[PDB]
Design a binder for these strands. Structure first.
Lengths: 155, 64, 114
RNA sequence: AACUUGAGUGCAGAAGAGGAAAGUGGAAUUCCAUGUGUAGCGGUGAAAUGCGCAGAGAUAUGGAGGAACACCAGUGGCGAAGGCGACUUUCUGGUCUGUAACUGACGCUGAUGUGCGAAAGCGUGGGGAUCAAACAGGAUUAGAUACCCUGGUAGUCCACGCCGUAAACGAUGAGUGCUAAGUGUUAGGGGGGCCCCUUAGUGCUGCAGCUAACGCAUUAAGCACUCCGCCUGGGGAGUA
């Protein structure tokens, strides 16, 4: 906000895979404070993508996250009757927040039977550069590509 | 600073004296302000007249 | 030719017309910021001028241009980016002269806005 | 009758976009003709009208025409005011400084009068580049006979006349003399590049004093004398 910066609340490493990224994915799946389900959703999908791909569950997840994380965002400026869409490079911390969010949202929007299979399906598709999660960043990059003429309007 | 027209005693600036005038025309032939050259008000006027006479007679450039 | 082809750059508050002609005033090619698909408020930007210059600069190399004189005519934002867009293409800029016309009066300037 | 200080004349100097006429230039705008040249140009907050593809914009050369004179250029200068900036020449007005050669009050103000008087406007005849009232569109708005954009006519220019109005303002009549200072700038003079003194302009602070206050203050809106113009609550009305 106006006064300086806000310290962020940190997470502890995952119980199984020992990854702070994995625990934050649970924090996104969780609805109404229900940790139990969210913890079961991920482990029923991490162990599931191992049967589909074959490689390590955390190894595919790390590959997939890289293919969802955006490199260049588009923040909005204003001169008047024209709104300046100024492309801004994404800071590393926001990239993980956006990549995890796009994994969950574009897994919920799909459907086969349940959430665990949808999450597992989206995880493998992201590592293969397919799915809505990677199509969101491709549009995020595209808008940053088009508006390079507004680069020097970065406040 | 010193006028060079009062210091050296020049009481008649000649438009044929192109060399003397080239000290006040800068890089374009643009007449230099008297604050920059430090000539008095009395001699800034007869120097401007001499410069403009030289420009017409093609002894000094209008622009450069 | 071989070299010595002057480049005239017209940087205004709108697009920057960059044209590359020989030493004797014969146009080889030209490329304005508006010919690159740029919309308004994109036309007068340093980024647009960057592509505007080099787009005409590549067309010059086909006639074998190794020397350019940059004659800039206009007070526009896309001036300096245009000149560095010529060296980035390897055109060996020699001189930077400004030729923005200055009337010794003798014309009634169009009324200003309100 | 007499006198010079007032006012003028003489002599020696000074500066000035003061005025009128005729010439001579350079930059720029527009248009025209070609060479090169290719798909845009231009404009906005975004647009679009609009100009282009029948070759526009750009660029180079040349030509035609009109208008105004960058830099110098400043609380700078001149003029009664309005106003006066390119250079040259010819006529021509005013002002300042010094001297004290001459006249010895020849002075001030000034109703009526008589002239000058920014822009806009009118008549006649020219000229017409640029910008343009009005007019056409294209937009914004709920509407937009407006601000924005694209063009565009009179006018803007010249010569004669007419008009005689402006926040034509320092919103401050003209003349004369007196009344603390400080510090500039313009044009001279006299003394010992510097200092001092001094004359006339033009500025900024600032005393006494004045004012309702703001403020003015040796360029008064202070202190005095002469003359002219003007005012007597607001509308109706600068209208009959």
């Amino acid at each position: 906000p106006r006064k300086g910066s806000v310290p962020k609340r940190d997470v502890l490493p995952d119980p199984i895979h020992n990854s702070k990224l994995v625990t934050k994915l649970i924090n996104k799946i969780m609805l109404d404070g229900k940790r139990g389900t969210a913890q079961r959703i991920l482990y029923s999908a991490f162990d599931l993508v191992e049967q589909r791909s074959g490689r390590d569950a955390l190894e595919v997840f790390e590959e997939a996250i890289n293919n969802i994380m955006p490199v260049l965002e588009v923040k909005a400026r204003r001169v008047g009757g024209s709104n300046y869409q100024v492309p801004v490079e994404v800071r590393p911390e926001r990239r993980t927040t956006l990549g995890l969010r796009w994994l969950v949202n574009y897994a919920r929007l799909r459907g086969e039977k349940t959430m665990e299979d949808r999450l597992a399906n989206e995880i493998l598709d992201a590592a293969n550069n397919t799915g809505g999660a990677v199509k969101k960043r491709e549009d995020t990059h595209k808008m940053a590509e088009a508006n390079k003429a507004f680069a020097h309007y970065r406040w | 600073k010193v006028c060079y027209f009062t210091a050296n005693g020049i009481t008649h600036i000649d438009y044929k004296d192109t060399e003397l005038l080239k000290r006040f025309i800068s890089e374009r032939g643009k007449i230099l302000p008297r604050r920059v050259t430090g000539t008095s008000a009395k001699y800034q006027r007869m120097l401007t007249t001499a410069i403009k006479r030289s420009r017409h007679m093609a002894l000094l450039p209008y622009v450069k | 030719n071989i070299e010595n082809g002057v480049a005239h750059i017209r940087s205004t508050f709108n697009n920057t017309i960059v044209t590359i002609t020989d030493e004797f005033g014969n146009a080889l090619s030209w490329s304005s910021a508006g010919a690159l698909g740029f919309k308004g408020s994109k036309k007068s930007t340093p980024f647009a001028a960057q592509m505007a210059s080099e787009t005409a600069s590549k067309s010059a190399m086909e006639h074998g241009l190794k020397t350019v004189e940059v004659t800039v005519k206009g007070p526009g934002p896309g001036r300096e980016s245009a000149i560095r867009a010529l060296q980035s293409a390897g055109l060996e800029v020699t001189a930077i002269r400004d030729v923005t016309p200055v009337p010794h009066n003798g014309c009634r300037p169009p009324k200003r806005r309100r």
